Amino acid sequence: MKSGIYQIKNTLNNKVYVGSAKDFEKRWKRHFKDLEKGCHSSIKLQRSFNKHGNVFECSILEEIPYEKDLIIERANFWIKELNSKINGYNIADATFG
Is 75:18 a contact under the CB 8 Å cutoff?
yes
Strand partners, 7: 18, 59
Strand partners, 60: 6
Within 8 A by CB and 6+ apart from 22, the residues are 1, 3, 66
Which experimental method was this entry solved with?
A: X-ray
CA-CA distance, 70 to 46, in Å (whole number)?
Answer: 28
Angle at which helix 43-52 crosses helix 24-37, to 10 degrees, equals 70
Say which CATH class 1-97 falls into: alpha beta
CA-CA distance, 18 to 26, in Å (whole number)?
Answer: 15
CA-CA distance, 53 to 47, in Å (whole number)?
Answer: 10
Please report the DSSP string for 41-70 in residue order: S-HHHHHHHHHHSS-EEEEEEEE----HHH
* For the chain, domain boundaries: 1-97
CA-CA distance, 48 to 52, in Å (whole number)?
Answer: 6
CA-CA distance, 92 to 95, in Å (whole number)?
Answer: 9
Is 33:12 a contact under the CB 8 Å cutoff?
no
